[PDB]
Paper text:
The ThAOS catalyzes the Claisen-like condensation between various amino acids and acyl-CoA substrates to generate a range of α-aminoketones. Like other members of the AOS family, ThAOS forms a tight homodimer with the PLP cofactor bound at the interface between the two monomers, typical of type IV PLP-binding enzymes. We next characterized ThAOS thermostability, finding it stable at temperatures of up to 80 °C over 3 h.
We predict that Arg366 is involved in similar functions in ThAOS, allowing the biocatalyst to accept the observed broad range of AAs. The acceptance of acyl-CoA substrates ranging from C2–C8 is more difficult to understand since there is a lack of high-resolution structures of bacterial AOS:acyl-CoA complexes. However, the observation that ThAOS can use various acyl-CoAs suggests that the binding site is suitably dynamic to accommodate a broad range of acyl chains.
Residue numbers in the entry:
A (entry chain A), B (entry chain D): 2 to 396
Write the structure that this text describes.
């Protein structure tokens, strides 16, 4: 007796509801901005990755307008056939210059960039050392390779060295980590990891989705912040969808790497290139961060202020260091309930559970941005005070 | 003694050059249109997926402009956190209505839509029956599941029935096929596959990247063309990047499938939603095909005109039933030589040979579009005449 479509779907949704993991996302009814509309109310938004306030900045929109009008709505092909236009190259040139790498290649997302670059680089016999809290896109990248996969305890460089001591290969050794961990907000210890990689002849792969536009001067990233951006055995991959407020992912490094990716990255070979309006906006984003580098200063001013007041109220921010400021709730239902209560106070910050974070490590991610005002952050803090007291998790 | 980054890149590029697989994409210098510029020359373009001539259409661009101005450059989040806006819902409503399915969900790409839907649906114990010529994105979707994978010979429903007789499960049986196969331009025999699925209590999964906007009334797709659009045990996945001339993929079907994907599809959970200008253009595309359904008629008129003159000259178009028009050259060298010679005549089309198709089945892939004129197709045909005569494959 084989299952029909509705019966498999129904069983899975029922399983998710019993495990307390089932979700009902909200619809935003105004632009992506530090205050927006949810369910018909003005809310302070701490749920987005809009770090630099670019998502609705008029300068990105004007550059997007220009490219849209001139080139059109769609590329109409994959990059390697008839999908590469002058505007793709212009962006790869500007991005390489910004990153201070020899080359940059843009892929259709951060999610697919991880599949493309890890797929292109890795072969049977290779050994990968993954931080246990690596983003899900990296797990999927690695599962499509025939590399041996090992996991080191989160940011635990003593444990990484033990595995480097114990697991040799004539092939590639790849140490893979988020630059900034999506849901934890802490920074990979590259100052220790990169030297450790040179000691054991390993290459380091940094997924810098939450470091790009955040860490380093003018937000050039985690690798740049630790000063390794010219190291040939360091490979950077990052989304253009967070601080840079568009879509796409990039890979940065030697021109030889770019050429291997153009030839081997499956998402690059088999998926349409990005359209004019998206590339125009990203060109605008790189121009704007050059004109207004004070946006990164402002982001970090708001962060230290907001993170300090949350700690002061008695909340566990998991040793987050970046504008990502998590509040642990443990069980997913408490995370959802806290979120619902915050929304009652006009504060939008979304409870997160398994898949996206571990079982019993459910949390609300708060992401502070350059465009938040003190008034907005104080409204959010006041709501975290009231909701925290009502739930008995603080004073 | 392990390999450094430069050494692995160098070895892979060297391998690709020796095996004749190394590629150097061309850069297009004008918009995606039936005539464009490549390498400083005007060409009749038969290399794009721009089936309805939407990629640079002023109606899609004006709708994109309107959404960009109103909503901005970026969504700034994944759909399940703070990335769903009014405009995503507007598109999923109009798309479901257009397809005549209960539900429609947009994902980051056609490529990732296959990973999301196959991942959400499939579990250990399930049995998948794949057409052997299924697109690469389906392979990657299936490799991330624990389903038992079986391959039936291309379009061979006798062979499918043998495997259906031999392999039962208490779980899901999923028959997976392209709707239109990229390489020979043939249509999945759904009129035989779907009855065969009802006989063995299987669900059918159709990747309709090359059927969406092409087959069915107003290009509602292969499944609609065979009349199975309201069947809950038929699941559609398709790119919005080809006929619809933007980016993204959709999943269309049963109302509860959407909700399972929102909760479980990894590409949906872990990749940023698409921005205003992309969604605005796709809204425009669906409105435009409603106002000008004669564009689908024109697409098919141009196809029959192009195929008729090739048959008359003595070329073999491999039984293609779609605007995808392969011209057999046999040996890969002769297919690449013909392609280069067509470009010399100002005609841009894609040579394909071994690896990508079998030994002795090399061809030039042409895609005819609604926006090609008789003048453009006559230029292409005249070049096929000259090149064919010079190579001694025709009179
Ligand atoms: C957000 C994120 C991605 C995916 O970026 P998209 O462009 O949204 O696919 C990948 N890796 C990490 C660590 C991320 O945080
Ligand atoms: C084009 C295509 C895809 C991928 O669509 P993208 O949106 O370009 O990623 C997937 N499957 C098939 C069969 C295709 O033809
Ligand atoms: Na207070």
């Amino acid at each position: 007796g084989s299952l029909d479509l509705r019966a498999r779907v129904r069983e899975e949704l029922e399983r998710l509801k019993r495990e307390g993991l089932y979700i009902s996302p909200k619809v935003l009814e105004a632009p992506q901005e530090p205050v927006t509309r949810v369910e018909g109310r003005e809310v302070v938004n701490l749920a987005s990755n809009n770090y630099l306030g670019f998502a609705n900045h008029p300068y990105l929109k004007e550059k997007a307008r220009q490219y849209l009008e001139k080139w059109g709505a769609g590329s109409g092909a994959v990059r390697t056939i008839a999908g590469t236009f002058t505007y793709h190259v212009e962006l790869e040139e500007a991005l390489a210059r910004f990153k201070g790498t020899e080359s940059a290649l843009v892929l259709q997302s951060g999610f697919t960039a991880n599949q493309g670059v890890l797929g292109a680089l890795l072969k049977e016999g290779d050994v990968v050392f993954s931080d246990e809290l690596n983003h899900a896109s990296i797990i999927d990248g690695l599962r499509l390779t025939k590399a041996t996969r090992l996991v080191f305890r989160h940011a635990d460089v003593a444990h990484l060295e033990e595995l480097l001591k114990a697991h040799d290969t004539d092939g590639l050794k790849l140490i893979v980590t988020d630059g900034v961990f999506s849901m934890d907000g802490d920074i990979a210890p590259l100052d220790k990891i990169v030297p450790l990689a040179k000691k054991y002849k390993a290459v380091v792969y940094v997924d810098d989705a939450h470091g790009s536009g955040v860490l380093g001067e003018k937000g050039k990233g985690t690798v740049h912040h630790f000063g390794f951006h010219q190291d040939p055995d360091v490979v950077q991959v990052a989304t253009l969808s967070k601080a840079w407020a568009g879509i796409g992912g990039y890979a940065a490094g030697a021109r030889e790497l770019k050429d291997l990716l153009i030839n081997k990255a499956r998402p690059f070979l088999f998926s349409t290139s990005h359209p004019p309006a998206v590339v125009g906006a990203l060109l605008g984003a790189l121009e704007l961060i050059e004109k207004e580098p004070e946006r990164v200063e402002r982001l970090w001013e708001n962060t230290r202020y907001f993170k300090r007041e949350l700690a002061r109220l008695g909340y566990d921010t998991l040793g987050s260091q970046t504008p990502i400021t998590p509040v642990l709730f443990g069980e997913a239902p408490l995370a959802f309930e806290a979120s619902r209560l915050l929304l009652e106070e006009g504060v939008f910050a979304v409870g997160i559970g398994f898949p996206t974070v571990p079982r019993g490590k459910a949390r609300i991610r708060n992401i502070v941005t350059a465009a938040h005002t003190k008034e907005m952050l104080d409204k959010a803090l006041e709501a975290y005070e009231k909701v925290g007291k009502r739930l008995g998790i603080i004073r």
